[PDB]
Write a protein that binds this ligand. Structure first.
Ligand SMILES: [K+]
Ligand SMILES: [K+]
Ligand SMILES: [K+]
Ligand SMILES: [K+]
Ligand SMILES: [K+]
Ligand SMILES: [K+]
Ligand SMILES: [K+]
Ligand SMILES: [K+]
Ligand SMILES: [K+]
Ligand SMILES: [K+]
Ligand SMILES: [K+]
Ligand SMILES: [K+]
Ligand SMILES: [Mg+2]
Ligand SMILES: [Mg+2]
Ligand SMILES: [Mg+2]
Ligand SMILES: [Mg+2]
Ligand SMILES: [Mg+2]
Ligand SMILES: [Mg+2]
Ligand SMILES: [Mg+2]
Ligand SMILES: [Mg+2]
Ligand SMILES: [Mg+2]
Ligand SMILES: [Mg+2]
Ligand SMILES: [Mg+2]
Ligand SMILES: [Mg+2]
Ligand SMILES: [Mg+2]
Ligand SMILES: [Mg+2]
Ligand SMILES: [Mg+2]
Ligand SMILES: [Mg+2]
Ligand SMILES: [Mg+2]
Ligand SMILES: [Mg+2]
Ligand SMILES: [Mg+2]
Ligand SMILES: [Mg+2]
Ligand SMILES: [Mg+2]
Ligand SMILES: [Mg+2]
Ligand SMILES: [Mg+2]
Ligand SMILES: [Mg+2]
Ligand SMILES: [Mg+2]
Ligand SMILES: [Mg+2]
Ligand SMILES: [Mg+2]
Ligand SMILES: [Mg+2]
Ligand code: NA
Ligand code: NA
Ligand code: NA
Ligand code: NA
Ligand code: NA
Lengths: 183, 260, 192, 71
RNA sequence: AGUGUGGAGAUCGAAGAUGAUUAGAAACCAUUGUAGUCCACACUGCAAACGAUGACACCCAUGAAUUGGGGAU
RNA sequence: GAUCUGGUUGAUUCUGCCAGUAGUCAUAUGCUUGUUUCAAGGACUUAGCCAUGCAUGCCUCAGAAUCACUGCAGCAGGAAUCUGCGCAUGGCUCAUUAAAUCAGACGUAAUCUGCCGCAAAAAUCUUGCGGCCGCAAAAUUGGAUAACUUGGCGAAACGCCAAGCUAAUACAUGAACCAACCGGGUGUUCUCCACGUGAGACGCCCAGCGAAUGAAUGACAGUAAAACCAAUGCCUUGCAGUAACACCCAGCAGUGUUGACUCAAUUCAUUCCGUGCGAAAGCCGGCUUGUUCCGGCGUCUUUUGACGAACAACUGCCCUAUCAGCUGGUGAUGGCCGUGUAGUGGACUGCCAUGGCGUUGACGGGAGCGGGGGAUUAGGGUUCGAUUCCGGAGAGGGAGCCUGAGAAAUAGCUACCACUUCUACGGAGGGCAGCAGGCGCGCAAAUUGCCCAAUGUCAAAACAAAACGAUGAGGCAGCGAAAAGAAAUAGAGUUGUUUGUCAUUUCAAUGGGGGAUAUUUAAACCCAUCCAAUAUCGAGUAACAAUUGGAGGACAAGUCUGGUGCCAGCACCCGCGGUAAUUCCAGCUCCAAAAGCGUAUAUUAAUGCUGUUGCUGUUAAAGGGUUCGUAGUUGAACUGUGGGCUGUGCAGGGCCCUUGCAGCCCGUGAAAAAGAAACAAGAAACACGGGAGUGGGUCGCAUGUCAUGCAUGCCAGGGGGCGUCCGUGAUUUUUACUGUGACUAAAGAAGCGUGACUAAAGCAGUCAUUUGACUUGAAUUAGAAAG
RNA sequence: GGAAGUCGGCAAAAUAGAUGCGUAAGUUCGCAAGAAGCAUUGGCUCUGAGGGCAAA
C-alpha cells in the first residue's frame, strides 16, 4: 500500500533447459571461478546482454550524433574504469566483443586469488565472506564485488581481521578462554 | 475544494523525495499559482535548511521572521513564488527567487538596497471605480496609478519599501527577457522578433548572448533589462546561458578529477 | 428535482443515454414565478453562491422609460394587452419580459409640460406660472425635439403602451419602456 | 469544412472530411465528422460550398459554431 | 433433374410389372412401362457449373502447325 | 540469441495440427525451508450480510467566565457553554458506464467561487443637557439568549419541556460638525447690460459603493478653396492667432481593454422596502503612559487574482448484421418571444418549419470504470491494467431536501422496498465498498497491535512556561515461500593408499546463535558495532544433518532391479506393461534446479498456425457458375536539363564533364538611378499622433506669463526609407508528406554523475578537519494520435 | 363466497358509444383484429383553425 521502491530482476534462466554443451561449459565456469550455483553466471549473462544491446543501438547512429557522442563516451568510461575493456581499445566496437570470462575476471573473488592473497578461488570466496579483506580500507564481504582498476592497488587485509592489525581470531580466542577457566 | 496535495502530484522543483513524505504542503491560495511556487515551509526547510522538520518550520514562520516583499508571512503554505525578495532580519539573508538555466528556482542573494528594487509583469489593464486605471501583475498586486505608457506585457520595476513604481520597461524587440515557462524557462535572451497570431498564443523568438536562436510563447518571457549587456537586477550565477550537455558533462568530470 | 442536464435527452442519433450518475445540485431547476398583476408580493430565493434571487409573485408598479427622451418615471401597471408566447398569458395577466403592458401616462405628461411647456391636455403643472427666463429654455428645446403623434395621442387618453424589459421572476421588478416608432405601429395592428 | 445540408432555418450542416492513420497497417482511412453551424442571412451558402466556422457559446442543443466566410 | 398450366407423346425411360441370376437379388441382364424425355408461358437457381487454376496490366526462349482479318510477290 | 524438437510412412518429401520448451509484481495448490534486505496481501465469487472500539474536531497576548472550579493574594490557570471555522477534505470500493467516462489539446466574452494575496472606502440628522426649538460634542446605544440555578417529564433515546438571571466579534440600531471636486431641474427671488443662446449671487430637489430599467460615450483614419446669413470669439475703434472653458482649477482626462465585447468605467432619468453596505459602538499590546501616541489583530460591504466548481467538446478509444434502419403524440433537428439556471442551451412552456443520424456501421445487444502504466517482444506486434498517482462514480436499493461559498452529502436529514436491533410494548433505533475483526461465498487473500516521532489535513493555533490539540489519513511492528536483491551449509594442509579418490594427523576463520558501554528507535523491534578499552561466550559426524522431479525419445541421467504378466500402474505427446518391463511399484548411483522445486488454469514468445512488415488457395483447407454493377480501393504521359568566366580531376570522346569561387534583367526582349520586364497579399495606392517611451532614420533667446507656461522650439525645406493602425485593390491557394521549434504531472522505462561495502535502490553527498568552501548536484531523453 | 349447482355456465349476470395509444401465435400475406389491453368523456367562459363575394 503506497510503497514506492523498485525491485527489478538481474538474471534469466536459459531457453533450453538441457543442453549438454551449455551444461558442461557452465560447469567449467563454476569450478574454474568458484560459484555456488548457475545464477551467478546468468546474472553475468544479463549484465553483458544489456551493455551489448545499448552498444548495438549506438553504432547505428552517426558518430556525430549527440546521443551517440554522449552515451558512447559514457559507456567507454564504464568499461575502462571497471577494467572490462583494455584502455587502448578506444572504439565503440570493442564493447560488442566483450565476453563472459572478462566480467568474472573483475570479480573480487577472482582478483583476490589472482593477487596472491588467496591460493585458490574457493579460498578467496570464504575469505571475503569472513570480513578478512578491505578495499580502500573498507571491509567488503561480498564475492561479486566488481573492482575498478584504480582501486586494485588498495586491496589488502582488513585492519580488524586477525591476519593484520586486528585482534586474534576465534580459535586463538576460545581455546585461550578454556585454559584460563581450567586454572 | 481539495486540501491535500500528494507527494507525487507535487511539483518536481521542490525536490521532496517520494520515500519520506506521503503528502506535501498544499500551497494555500495567494500571490502565485501552486504549480509555480515554493511553499514557505519548503523554502525554509528544504532550501535554506534552517528548519529540521515541518514542526520546526512553523516555529520560524509564525514568529514573523520571514519577510516577503517587505512584509512578514506566518503561513507555511504561503506561495512565495518567482521574483520575490525574501528577508530574514535575524540572519540578514536578503535574497530573491529566480530561475536558473535549468528552469529551477534559485535563491539569488541580493546586495543592500537591491531588495527595494523589484519587478513584476503587467497581465491586465482595467479601470476601477471612478475611472481609475489599474494594472494587475504576476504577483497579484494591483497598481492603482501606473504610468500612462504602461501596457500589457511590460514590466514595471516596483519599490517594495516605498510601495511605489519607479520605472517602466516596454515590451519591444531588442530587450533583455528571461523565460518563465517550459524547458526554455530560466534563459536570458534578446527579443529579435515577436510573431503575433491573433487568438492563439504569441511566439517570441529570442537570441541569447552566445548566439543561440530559441523561441517560446510570449506569455513566458519577462523583460529584465533594456539590453542584454545591462540588466536591472542580479540574475542566477549561470548568467542565463544553457551550454551543451556533452560539454556540461566533460567540464564537471574534469573538475571532479581536479579535486583528486 | 427539476434538472437542466442533457442526460434525459435523446442523442442526435436518436439513441437512449444510459445514465450512471445520480442527479446533482449544480444542475437543478426551480419552479417559475408566474408573476401576475396585483399588490406587491415577492419571495426571495437563495441562489448559488449565497446571492438572493427575488421571485416576484405579484407586481403593480415599475420604472417605465421614454427612450426617445432618456427619461424614466415610476408608474403603475394598468393592464397587460399582448404576449408573443400565448393568449393564456394575456388572459391570466402574467407579467413576463417583453410582454406588452399599459401603464399610467400621467407622469410623462407632467414631465413633458415641465420640459417643453406644451401641455398635451391643452397639483397639476401650470406652464404660465414659469418665470420668463424659462420660456427661452423651452424654445431652445422645442427646436431640438419633435414628438410623434401616435405617442402624444396616448398621453392625451391617459394610458400609454409599453414593453417590459426586466425579468420579474429573477429581479423581482417589472420595469419597461414606452413603445415608440415602428415597434408601436407593429403592436397596434395586432391589438386592433 | 464543406456545406453538407442547408435544409434547416438559419442553420447548416458541414462535413469535415479527413484521413485517419492506422498505425499497425501503416495506412490511412477516410473519415468524416458532421457539425451543426449557425449561418447568418449575410452569407446564403449552397450545398457543396466551402465555409469557415468559428467556435461560439452553445446556441442550441447541437450548435457551437458560427459561419465566418463562404467560399 | 424437379414444379405449375396448356399441348405433344415416335424413341428411350425414374416408379411399377413380369422373366432370369442368386444363399438371398421388386440390383446388374431380358421384355415392358408411368412420370418424364419434346414445345409455349411462368417458377427453381442445388453441377466434377472444372483449367478442381478470380479479374485487369507489364516482361518473357524455341520449332512445327491452326482459325479469322490485313500487307507484299 | 532474429534458435527450435517429438508424433501421419515399409522408407521418402510436404501440408498441418497436437505435444514439448522459456517468461509472467499471475492466481491457486503439493513438497521443502538456515541469513539478510525490499515487499503484494477478501479485487476475481456475493457493490453479499455484519457485534464491537476507534476513525473530525479545534483556544491564545489577542470574541465571550461571578463554575457556590483550582492556586496565590484582586492576579494567573480554567471545566462547561455560547460564538467562529471545519466536517463537500482524506480513506475505501469498481457496481454503473461507449457522441458517457477518460487522455492529449482548447474554451467559458455562458458562469459561480468560502479559506488565501493585493487593493478601494467622504452616502447616513447620532448623543448629553431645559421647555419640535436652544446649547454642547474622543458617541458613556438597546433588548434578548446560552452556560448556570430551580422544578422536572421519560424504560431508554447522539430524547425532552417551564420558570429566573447573565454576556459577547451572537442579534438589532446608529454616528450631525470636523469633511472636498463634481453636474442636472428649478425660482413668476434679488443686482445689473441692450432694451434676450444675456450675465452674477442666493433659496430647495436630487447628485456615495453595488444592484434594476432606459438614453449617450466607450473614436476617425479614400478631396482642395471661396462667398452668404444669424450668433459667438478676437485686433482696432476685418480675419491674423487659436486647445476646451462666461472665473475664483487661465490642460483637475478630447485618449480602458482585448484579436473581438451589448464588457470595464463615466455622465443623465427613475428605482432598491429584507432580498445588500458600521469606524464590528470589537479584542490585545508596547513606551514619552498622550479629549490628535504608536503597533498587532479582528470584521461588514466593493473589487480582481489565485485555489477550486460547473458546463461545452478538436482527435482517439473492444466484440457483434443470426442487430438495418434510428428519432419525432408526451422534443426528435432548427427558428421566434419567453421561463428556469450561477450561466449558455429543447434545459423547459407556447407557436412555427420538417428536419437530424446511418453500411465511413447508426439503433440494439455483450464484455468492461478511463489513463499514466505491467508482461512479452529483433522489428512490426499480442496481451493485461479492480489495485498505490490523476479523472469519474457510489456508500443495501431508489428518490427528494436543509444548511452551506461549495453536497442532491449519507460515521446529514425525510419517505418507500428489502433486511434487521433494544424495549418497561407505550415506543425508539441501523447502514464497515474506512481501520481492526466475524459468517457465508469460494481454488483463493493478514492483527479487534503501537504511535502522532516523520508527512500532511483542519483548527481560535509557532515552541516554551499549572499551559503537551484531533487524526485507524499516515508512519512503525505482527502474520505473510505473491514477487524481487545480496547470500550459509565450510577453507587449507603432512603421511600412507604425474595425477586424482580414500583413510589419517591436524591448523587457523567466520557466521547462525548468546549477550552488551551501549547504538537505532516516539518507545520498541530490526539492521549496523563489539567479544574489553584494566575487564566481554560460543562449529568437527563443524547432526548448526537440502529438498523436488526424473534416468526409452523430445531432454541431462542406468546391459542394477524384483514382482505383476495388456493386470496393478505409468504416460503433457510418441509409447511401456500378455512370465528374462526400456516406462509399473523400490535401493544405489547419476542427472537437472537449488532455499527452492513440482502440478492446474490463464496469458506472452515459440507461431511467417491471423501474415501491414509477412501466410496460403492446380492436386493438402480454401477462386464466387457467369456477366452487369453501385459505395469502397486503385488509377496513364505532359507545363521542369539555367547559363558565362578563372582554376582544378589518369575525366572522356576547340567540345562535354566532377569539385571550388565570382558573375548573371538568372529565357527573349527592353534600359537596371529611373523607367521597363520578371516578380512581389510577408505587395501596392490612399489615408490617420489618441502611430515612434515628446512625430522613427534620413545655454540664453523666439512663443506666453493672473499659469509648477518651471510649458514648446532652437534647422528651414524637399525627397524617399521605414516600426504601428484603418480603408481600397490579386478572373485570391490549401492539405497530406518532410526539417526544425513551442506546449506537455510525477511514479514507471532509458540515460549523465554518484564505490549507499556490492546489488535490487535513493538523489544523494564529497573535502579540509572545520566556526565553511564545492557560490555543491539533483543533467539529458523517449513517451501514440490530434492540436 | 363465486360454478362448490348441473349431463352440461341452462338461465342470468357481464362487455359495450366515440376518440387516442397498443395489439400475439398462426397465415392462402388478404387476414387474425374490435385480438388482447390502457386512457379520456360532463357544464360553463374563452382562444385558435378550417370559407364565400365585392372593390384597382
Ligand atoms: K517494474
Ligand atoms: K482567449
Ligand atoms: K422399352
Ligand atoms: K458554532
Ligand atoms: K433563448
Ligand atoms: K481514486
Ligand atoms: K526406477
Ligand atoms: K510497412
Ligand atoms: K471459376
Ligand atoms: K372472482
Ligand atoms: K358428467
Ligand atoms: K378494443
Ligand atoms: Mg412439366
Ligand atoms: Mg429397363
Ligand atoms: Mg457450388
Ligand atoms: Mg474450385
Ligand atoms: Mg497420411
Ligand atoms: Mg503446446
Ligand atoms: Mg474523495
Ligand atoms: Mg463491471
Ligand atoms: Mg485502466
Ligand atoms: Mg469486478
Ligand atoms: Mg457521492
Ligand atoms: Mg454492503
Ligand atoms: Mg445520499
Ligand atoms: Mg461507515
Ligand atoms: Mg439507508
Ligand atoms: Mg474492514
Ligand atoms: Mg526387471
Ligand atoms: Mg509439463
Ligand atoms: Mg502466444
Ligand atoms: Mg504470431
Ligand atoms: Mg517471430
Ligand atoms: Mg499456412
Ligand atoms: Mg481442395
Ligand atoms: Mg500520375
Ligand atoms: Mg537576357
Ligand atoms: Mg523514474
Ligand atoms: Mg346463455
Ligand atoms: Mg404478428
Ligand atoms: Na451369390
Ligand atoms: Na475438368
Ligand atoms: Na475465327
Ligand atoms: Na511406423
Ligand atoms: Na359447473
Amino acid at each position: 500500500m503506497r510503497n514506492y521502491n523498485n525491485f527489478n530482476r538481474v538474471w534469466k534462466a536459459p531457453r533450453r533447459p538441457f543442453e549438454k554443451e551449455r551444461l558442461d561449459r557452465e560447469m567449467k565456469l563454476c569450478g574454474q571461478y568458484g560459484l555456488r550455483c548457475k545464477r551467478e553466471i546468468w546474472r553475468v549473462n544479463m549484465t553483458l546482454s544489456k551493455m551489448r544491446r545499448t552498444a548495438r543501438l549506438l553504432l547505428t547512429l552517426p558518430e556525430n550524433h549527440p546521443r551517440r557522442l554522449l552515451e558512447g563516451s559514457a559507456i567507454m568510461r564504464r568499461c575502462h574504469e571497471y577494467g572490462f575493456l583494455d584502455e587502448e581499445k578506444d572504439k565503440l566496437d570493442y564493447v560488442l566483443s566483450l565476453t563472459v570470462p572478462d566480467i568474472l575476471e573483475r570479480r573480487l573473488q577472482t582478483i583476490v586469488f589472482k593477487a596472491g592473497l588467496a591460493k585458490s578461488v574457493h579460498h578467496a570466496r570464504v575469505l571475503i565472506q569472513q570480513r578478512h579483506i578491505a578495499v580502500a580500507k573498507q571491509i567488503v564481504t561480498i564475492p561479486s564485488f566488481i573492482v575498478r582498476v584504480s582501486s586494485e592497488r588498495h586491496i589488502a587485509f582488513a585492519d580488524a581481521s586477525p591476519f593484520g592489525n586486528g585482534r586474534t581470531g576465534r580459535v586463538k580466542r576460545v581455546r585461550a578462554k578454556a585454559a584460563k577457566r581450567h586454572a | 475544494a481539495k486540501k491535500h496535495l500528494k507527494r507525487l502530484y507535487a511539483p518536481k522543483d521542490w525536490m521532496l523525495s517520494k520515500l519520506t513524505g506521503v503528502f506535501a504542503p498544499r500551497p494555500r491560495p495567494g500571490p502565485h499559482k501552486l504549480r509555480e511556487c515554493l511553499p514557505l515551509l519548503v523554502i525554509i526547510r528544504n532550501r535554506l535548511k534552517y528548519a529540521l522538520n515541518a514542526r520546526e518550520g512553523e516555529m520560524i514562520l509564525r514568529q514573523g521572521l520571514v519577510h516577503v516583499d517587505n512584509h512578514p508571512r506566518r503561513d507555511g503554505k504561503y506561495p512565495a513564488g518567482f521574483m520575490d525578495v525574501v528577508e530574514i532580519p535575524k540572519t540578514g539573508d536578503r535574497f530573491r527567487l529566480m530561475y536558473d538555466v535549468k528552469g529551477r528556482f534559485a535563491l539569488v542573494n541580493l546586495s543592500e538596497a537591491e531588495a527595494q528594487i523589484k519587478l513584476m509583469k503587467v497581465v491586465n489593464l482595467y479601470t476601477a471605480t471612478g475611472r481609475v486605471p489599474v494594472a494587475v501583475t504576476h504577483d497579484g498586486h494591483r497598481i492603482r496609478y501606473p504610468d500612462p505608457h504602461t501596457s500589457i506585457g511590460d514590466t514595471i520595476v516596483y519599490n517594495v519599501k516605498e510601495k511605489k513604481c519607479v520605472d517602466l520597461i516596454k515590451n519591444r524587440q531588442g530587450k533583455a527577457v528571461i523565460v518563465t515557462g517550459g524547458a526554455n524557462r530560466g534563459r536570458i535572451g534578446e527579443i529579435v522578433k515577436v510573431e503575433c497570431h491573433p487568438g492563439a498564443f504569441n511566439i517570441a523568438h529570442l537570441k541569447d548572448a552566445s548566439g543561440a536562436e530559441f523561441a517560446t510563447r510570449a506569455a513566458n518571457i519577462f523583460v529584465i533589462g533594456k539590453d542584454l549587456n545591462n540588466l536591472q537586477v542580479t540574475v542566477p550565477k549561470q548568467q542565463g546561458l544553457r551550454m551543451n550537455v556533452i560539454q556540461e558533462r566533460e567540464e564537471r568530470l574534469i573538475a571532479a578529477e581536479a579535486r583528486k | 428535482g427539476i434538472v437542466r442536464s442533457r442526460l434525459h435527452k435523446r442523442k442526435i442519433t436518436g439513441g437512449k443515454t444510459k445514465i450512471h450518475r445520480k442527479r446533482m445540485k449544480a444542475e437543478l431547476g426551480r419552479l417559475p414565478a408566474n408573476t401576475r398583476l396585483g399588490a406587491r408580493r415577492v419571495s426571495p430565493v437563495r441562489a448559488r453562491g449565497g446571492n438572493f434571487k427575488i421571485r416576484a409573485l405579484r407586481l403593480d408598479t415599475g420604472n417605465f422609460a421614454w427612450a426617445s427622451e432618456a427619461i424614466a418615471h415610476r408608474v403603475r401597471l394598468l393592464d397587460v394587452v399582448y404576449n408573443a408566447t400565448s393568449n393564456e398569458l394575456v388572459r391570466t395577466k402574467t407579467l413576463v419580459k417583453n410582454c406588452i403592458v399599459a401603464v399610467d401616462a400621467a407622469p410623462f405628461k407632467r414631465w413633458y409640460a415641465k420640459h417643453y411647456g406644451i401641455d398635451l391636455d391643452a397639483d397639476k403643472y401650470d406652464v404660465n406660472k414659469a418665470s420668463p427666463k424659462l420660456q427661452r429654455e423651452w424654445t431652445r428645446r422645442r427646436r431640438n425635439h419633435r414628438v410623434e403623434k401616435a405617442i402624444a395621442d396616448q398621453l392625451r387618453e391617459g394610458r400609454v403602451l409599453a414593453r417590459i424589459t426586466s425579468r420579474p421572476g429573477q429581479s423581482g421588478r417589472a420595469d419597461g419602456i414606452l413603445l415608440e416608432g415602428a415597434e408601436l405601429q407593429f403592436y397596434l395592428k395586432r391589438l386592433e | 469544412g464543406v456545406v453538407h445540408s442547408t435544409k434547416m432555418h438559419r442553420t447548416i450542416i458541414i462535413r469535415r472530411n479527413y484521413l485517419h492513420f492506422i498505425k499497425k497497417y501503416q495506412r490511412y482511412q477516410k473519415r468524416h465528422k458532421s457539425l451543426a453551424v449557425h449561418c447568418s442571412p449575410a452569407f446564403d451558402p449552397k450545398q457543396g460550398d466551402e465555409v469557415v466556422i468559428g467556435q461560439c457559446r452553445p446556441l442550441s442543443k447541437t450548435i457551437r459554431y458560427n459561419v465566418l466566410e463562404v467560399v
